[PDB]
Design an enzyme around this catalytic site. Structure first.
Site, PDB file in Angstrom:
ATOM      1  N   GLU A   1      -3.168   9.671  -6.047  1.00 18.73           N
ATOM      2  CA  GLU A   1      -3.178  10.829  -5.174  1.00 18.73           C
ATOM      3  C   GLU A   1      -3.156  12.161  -5.941  1.00 18.73           C
ATOM      4  OE1 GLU A   1      -3.194   7.352  -3.107  1.00 18.73           O
ATOM      5  OE2 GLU A   1      -1.564   7.937  -4.492  1.00 18.73           O
TER       6      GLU A   1
ATOM      7  N   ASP B   1      -4.636   2.447  -8.552  1.00 13.91           N
ATOM      8  CA  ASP B   1      -3.653   2.660  -7.515  1.00 13.91           C
ATOM      9  C   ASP B   1      -2.955   3.993  -7.796  1.00 13.91           C
ATOM     10  OD1 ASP B   1      -1.936   2.123  -5.467  1.00 13.91           O
ATOM     11  OD2 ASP B   1      -0.489   0.994  -6.666  1.00 13.91           O
TER      12      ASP B   1
HETATM   13  O1  LIG Z   1       1.726  -1.812  -7.165  1.00 11.68           O
HETATM   14  C1  LIG Z   1       2.705  -1.911  -6.145  1.00 11.68           C
HETATM   15  C2  LIG Z   1       2.039  -1.415  -4.852  1.00 11.68           C
HETATM   16  C3  LIG Z   1       3.084  -1.590  -3.706  1.00 11.68           C
HETATM   17  C4  LIG Z   1       4.372  -0.803  -3.977  1.00 11.68           C
HETATM   18  C5  LIG Z   1       5.215  -0.296  -2.804  1.00 11.68           C
HETATM   19  C6  LIG Z   1       6.691  -0.627  -3.030  1.00 11.68           C
HETATM   20  C7  LIG Z   1       7.652  -0.218  -1.918  1.00 11.68           C
HETATM   21  C8  LIG Z   1       7.125  -0.292  -0.488  1.00 11.68           C
HETATM   22  C9  LIG Z   1       5.615  -0.108  -0.378  1.00 11.68           C
HETATM   23  C10 LIG Z   1       4.850  -0.873  -1.469  1.00 11.68           C
HETATM   24  N1  LIG Z   1       1.548  -0.009  -5.082  1.00 11.68           N
HETATM   25  C11 LIG Z   1       0.924   0.727  -3.957  1.00 11.68           C
HETATM   26  C12 LIG Z   1      -0.287  -0.080  -3.547  1.00 11.68           C
HETATM   27  O2  LIG Z   1      -0.799   0.511  -2.370  1.00 11.68           O
HETATM   28  C13 LIG Z   1       0.078  -1.576  -3.309  1.00 11.68           C
HETATM   29  O3  LIG Z   1      -1.082  -2.363  -3.064  1.00 11.68           O
HETATM   30  C14 LIG Z   1       0.765  -2.189  -4.526  1.00 11.68           C
HETATM   31  O4  LIG Z   1       1.043  -3.562  -4.274  1.00 11.68           O
END
Ligand SMILES: OC[C@@]1(CCC2CCCCC2)NC[C@H](O)[C@@H](O)[C@@H]1O
Ligand SMILES: *[C@@H]1O[C@H](CO)[C@@H](O[C@@H]2O[C@H](CO)[C@@H](O[C@@H]3O[C@H](CO)[C@@H](O)[C@H](O)[C@@H]3O)[C@H](O)[C@H]2NC(C)=O)[C@H](O)[C@H]1NC(C)=O
Ligand SMILES: *[C@@H]1O[C@H](CO[C@@H]2O[C@@H](C)[C@@H](O)[C@@H](O)[C@@H]2O)[C@@H](O[C@@H]2O[C@H](CO)[C@@H](O)[C@H](O)[C@H]2NC(C)=O)[C@H](O)[C@H]1NC(C)=O
Ligand SMILES: *[C@@H]1O[C@H](CO[C@@H]2O[C@@H](C)[C@@H](O)[C@@H](O)[C@@H]2O)[C@@H](O[C@@H]2O[C@H](CO)[C@@H](O)[C@H](O)[C@H]2NC(C)=O)[C@H](O)[C@H]1NC(C)=O
Ligand SMILES: *[C@@H]1O[C@H](CO)[C@@H](O[C@@H]2O[C@H](CO)[C@@H](O)[C@H](O)[C@H]2NC(C)=O)[C@H](O)[C@H]1NC(C)=O
Ligand SMILES: *[C@@H]1O[C@H](CO)[C@@H](O[C@@H]2O[C@H](CO)[C@@H](O)[C@H](O)[C@H]2NC(C)=O)[C@H](O)[C@H]1NC(C)=O
Ligand SMILES: [Cl-]
Ligand SMILES: [Cl-]
Ligand SMILES: [Cl-]
Length: 845
Positions: free
Chosen positions: A426, A423
């Protein structure tokens, strides 16, 4: 000189707001639009490069390009070298580079289908399809710009129909009405008009009559791709070189294949990777995590892979587990394995840098080995992510790869996870650039900023001028996620000795050779449900067939009806995971009303029945560069009606899925290419039976508990018996579904291996079987038979489109023990006791 038709005007002020006077002083034409179309545009006489000293070689051609008049950008490169390489009958390749300076480059009847010619002044490359004389590329249409930090190359397009240029939330077919498409990997919830998590500088273009070609620009710099209605397209990159490949097809499927011959055929996932994954942020303990599995099992919902998000970590740091809720993390994962399931967990790229020295091995070793992206003074660039202050690994540094392998392998000795969810790659930064901001140089403040959200290259990421082993971040940014996917893939191979399973947010061209992808933080809404179909198809076109969206959606709160419809469609995503945010109401299958659980269980049941089929389709992707989920136009390019269809999908050649994508609907209108389509509801898995289409839209009943699925006549599909895991389901007997053509013919196949080892094809450790229906017979043909596959039991043969009740059904020459014929549905259902790996003959009459 300024008499240029509106749709044909190419922008002479892409860099700034301009007045007429400044426009005219650049040597351009100013004509206001009457109502976007550029007001300032190049006349056909605008200075470009001039071709000189064109020369022939065995490979192709070389030439010098000369610009005599500067553009309005700084640092024009006035002398360029052209190299044209005619590499195969299908593949043309040319580069334009600075002959005096090595520039950044991405670390990557007999006659060709194309011919090439050159315009001398202004310079252009012209590529025809030889068979019909059609112009595919013509770069003469606009000037060539080639400056240190600005490349522009344009072409006419052969039609209004073009797809590619991920990652964006858009229709499969991109709009050519003055559309600007920005490739700069960016953490942002999917929305139209924004640069999202990945960048794939590749398009496929359809031509009248149903042929197609593809163009890859191998360039990883921030860029805009600008499409206009003439129709035409302009690449604008902020660095690197022009490295262009043209793939001649002629079929859309071959274009994709020819594209993947360069970037990499998709990797072969383990069989288990194709089952149901279930995750959320908020499973905040091992006890809660075990309950998910228990709850699914008691309600008869299949589940191959349990996941955790940040929950498992100690203070949100990679390669740790907390000692409150996750004290017994190792035992949970071993237990999972004991029951025949797998485990996935989130890994972020950035490494906590604020801990006491000596107390956190990943950072401490990271420091010792110089694995991190560094700043001006040679120190680690520090940003902010989940753990607080963080450093960012440089996955271009060989020493960083070695360090990543160690961390993964050492964590794997503590907790035997089965793959990695990568995750935030980027890479994503909670602050702009770094804790220390960024310097003022040309990389941070470039002469052309593409249309990125935030209007700067630093927004939501790290400084552009930061240092990596191979180049600056400016050049490598769009490769970050890719490089981590490579590092992780290698790490998992070494740590586990079997096929890796890597699911990555950020991606680049060539990603699917190493990993899969999910589409990120989609809202739980009807619109995002609908948008997920074109997006899944697009990624398949780009050679990333292991892809899906968060089933039922990620952000906000799903509804019961939305979750039912998301699950039905999602069971047809090649990668199928229900994932949910921290703040969201629960959306596991078991958390719904009884009628909804039934619809969800049915969708999971159908997916599991089809897993041998889905696995074979991935086999074809892996060895032949095929797509798994494909748009109708890939399979029926000559039917121009299919061109704009992106709300239906196919699995391979034969399975047409037509979902409801709207609240309150009990029917759906779907396009049906010419041929017969058998309703899969007529195949027994533990309303018209057939659609007879001329090429037409058909309205289908689709009550809440139904998704519409049809089987193309002429195809045979392998199926397997049920299980709550693939460990179970793989041990079950198999069945064929045989869709006869009117003339009584059908073909299909089965690829089978052990489901997880490396080098299966090279070692020959698989079974491959072909199935043929002809003249009231069904036989198998044994391409290859080995220990893996030889003892698969065939227990059931269903034949669709049998017009008359038979009097005798034989298996290997003996009346079978039981069959049914249904005169209403034209279905003949036969019980048998046969082996997939031993030659049989089933006949009826
Ligand atoms: O690890 C945490 C997350 C979500 C975090 C983020 C917190 C604030 C609003 C948007 C989701 N990482 C980004 C990932 O895209 C997502 O799947 C994953 O659950
Ligand atoms: C390159 O990256 C490094 C970190 O690897 C940056 O070092 C940081 O520099 C700033 C000063 O410019 C330090 O801030 C200072 O902290 C001290 C003590 O806590 C405080 O008393 C000072 O008044 C000041 O705020 C910061 O601590 C330091 N970071 C770390 C982790 O040590 C460096 O600045 C970067 N170089 C450039 C040009 O960006
Ligand atoms: C176009 O090429 C000419 C000729 O170059 C020669 O032939 C080539 C195939 C290659 O082998 C070259 O190295 C040869 O020099 C260039 O014109 C020459 O310019 C050079 C150096 O400026 C000079 O020594 C000669 O007098 C010139 N020769 C002739 C016959 O004109 C010319 O520079 C090339 N054009 C561009 C823009 O690169
Ligand atoms: C998603 O839902 C939660 C909770 O909504 C409430 O409980 C549900 C079971 C359902 O019956 C809803 O209609 C209820 O109203 C929302 O979180 C709530 O936020 C409000 C303030 O906005 C707060 O007063 C509540 O107590 C919160 N509930 C809890 C326990 O977390 C959330 O806003 C919803 N998300 C979105 C984007 O709409
Ligand atoms: C490639 O594109 C160029 C520019 O659009 C086309 O060249 C123009 O062609 C028309 C008719 O030949 C002329 O009136 C102009 O003089 C041409 N422009 C230039 C700059 O030469 C050209 O037709 C295209 N080539 C092909 C094969 O389609
Ligand atoms: C797994 O299922 C159990 C049984 O439904 C859930 O536990 C119940 O949750 C409700 C909250 O809506 C409580 O009122 C009860 O105290 C619980 N009942 C029982 C039987 O103990 C549990 O929440 C589910 N767990 C997960 C992770 O989904
Ligand atoms: Cl003005
Ligand atoms: Cl470089
Ligand atoms: Cl139509």
């Amino acid at each position: 000189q300024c008499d240029v038709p509106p749709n044909s005007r190419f922008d002479c002020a892409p860099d700034k707001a301009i007045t007429q006077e400044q426009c005219e002083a650049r040597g351009c034409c100013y004509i206001p639009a009457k109502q976007g179309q550029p007001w300032c545009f190049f006349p056909p006489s605008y200075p470009s490069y001039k071709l000189e000293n064109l020369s022939s070689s065995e490979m192709g051609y070389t030439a010098t390009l000369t610009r005599t008049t500067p553009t309005f950008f700084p640092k024009d490169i006035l002398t360029l070298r052209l190299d044209v390489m005619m590499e195969t009958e299908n593949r043309l390749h040319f580069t334009i580079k600075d002959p005096a300076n090595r520039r950044y480059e991405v670390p990557l009847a007999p006659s060709p289908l194309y011919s090439v010619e050159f315009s001398e002044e202004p310079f252009g490359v012209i590529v025809h399809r030889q068979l019909d004389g059609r112009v595919l590329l013509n770069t003469t249409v606009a000037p060539l710009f080639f400056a240190d930090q600005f490349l522009q190359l344009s072409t006419s397009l052969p039609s209004q129909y073009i797809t590619g240029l991920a990652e964006h939330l858009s229709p499969l077919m991109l709009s050519t009405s003055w559309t600007r498409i920005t490739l700069w990997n960016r953490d942002l919830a999917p929305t139209p008009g924004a640069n999202l998590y990945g960048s794939h500088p590749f398009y496929l273009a359809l031509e009248d009559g149903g042929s197609a070609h593809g163009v890859f620009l191998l360039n990883s710099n921030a860029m805009d791709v600008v499409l206009q209605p003439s129709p035409a397209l302009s690449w604008r990159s902020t660095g690197g070189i022009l490295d262009v490949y043209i793939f001649l097809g002629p079929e859309p499927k071959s274009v994709v294949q020819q594209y993947l011959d360069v970037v990499g055929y998709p990797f072969m996932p383990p069989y288990w990777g194709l089952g149901f994954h279930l995750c959320r942020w908020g499973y905040s303990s091992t006890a809660i995590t075990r309950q998910v599995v228990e709850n699914m099992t008691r309600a008869h919902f299949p589940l191959d892979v349990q996941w955790n998000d940040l929950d498992y970590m100690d203070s949100r740091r990679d390669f740790t587990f907390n000692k409150d809720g996750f004290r017994d993390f190792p035992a949970m994962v071993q237990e999972l394995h004991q029951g025949g399931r797998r485990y996935m967990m989130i890994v972020d790229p950035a490494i906590s840098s604020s801990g006491p020295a000596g107390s956190y091995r990943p950072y401490d070793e990271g420091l010792r080995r110089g694995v991190f992206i560094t700043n001006e003074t040679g120190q680690p660039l520090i940003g902010k992510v989940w753990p607080g202050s963080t450093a960012f690994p440089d996955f271009t540094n060989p020493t960083a790869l070695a360090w990543w392998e160690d961390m993964v392998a050492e964590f794997h000795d503590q907790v035997p996870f089965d793959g990695m969810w990568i995750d935030m790659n980027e890479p994503s930064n909670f602050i702009r650039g770094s804790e220390d901001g960024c310097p003022n140089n040309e990389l941070e403040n470039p002469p052309y900023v593409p249309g990125v959200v935030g209007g700067t290259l630093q927004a939501a990421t790290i400084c552009a001028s930061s240092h990596q082993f191979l180049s600056t971040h400016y050049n490598l940014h769009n490769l970050y996620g890719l490089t981590e996917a490579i590092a992780s893939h290698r790490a998992l191979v070494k740590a586990r000795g079997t096929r890796p399973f890597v699911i990555s947010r950020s991606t680049f061209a060539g990603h699917g050779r190493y990993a899969g992808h999910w589409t990120g933080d989609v809202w739980s809404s009807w619109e995002q449900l609908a948008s997920s179909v074109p997006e899944i198809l697009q990624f398949n076109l780009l050679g990333v067939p292991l892809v899906g969206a968060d089933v039922c959606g990620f952000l906000g709160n799903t509804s019961e009806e939305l979750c039912v419809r998301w699950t039905q469609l999602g069971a047809f995503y090649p990668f199928m995971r229900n994932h949910n945010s921290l703040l969201s109401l629960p959306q596991e299958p078991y958390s719904f009303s009884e009628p909804a659980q039934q619809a969800m269980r049915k969708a999971l049941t159908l997916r599991y029945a089809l897993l041998p089929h889905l696995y074979t389709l991935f086999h074809q992707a892996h060895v032949a560069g095929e797509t798994v989920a494909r748009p109708l136009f890939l399979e029926f390019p000559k039917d121009s009606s299919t061109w704009t269809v992106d709300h239906q999908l196919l699995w391979g050649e034969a399975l047409l899925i037509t979902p409801v994508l709207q609240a309150g609907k009990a029917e759906v209108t779907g396009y049906f290419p010419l041929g017969t389509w058998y309703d899969l509801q007529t195949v027994p898995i533990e309303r018209e039976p057939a659609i007879h289409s001329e090429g037409q839209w058909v309205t289908l009943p689709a009550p809440l508990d139904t998704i519409n699925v049809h089987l193309r006549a002429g195809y045979i599909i392998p199926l397997q018996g049920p299980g709550l895991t693939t460990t179970e389901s793989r041990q079950q007997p198999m069945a064929l579904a045989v869709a006869l053509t009117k003339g009584g013919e059908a073909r299909g196949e089965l690829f089978w291996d052990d489901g997880e080892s490396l080098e299966v094809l090279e070692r020959g450790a698989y079974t491959q079987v072909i199935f043929l229906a002809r003249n009231n017979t069904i036989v198998n043909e044994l391409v290859r038979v080995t220990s893996e596959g030889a003892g698969l039991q065939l227990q059931k043969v269903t034949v669709l489109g049998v017009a008359t009740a038979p009097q005798q059904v034989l298996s290997n020459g003996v009346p079978v023990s039981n069959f049914t014929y249904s005169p209403d549905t034209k279905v003949l259902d036969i019980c048998v006791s046969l082996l997939m790996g031993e030659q049989f003959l089933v006949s009826w009459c």
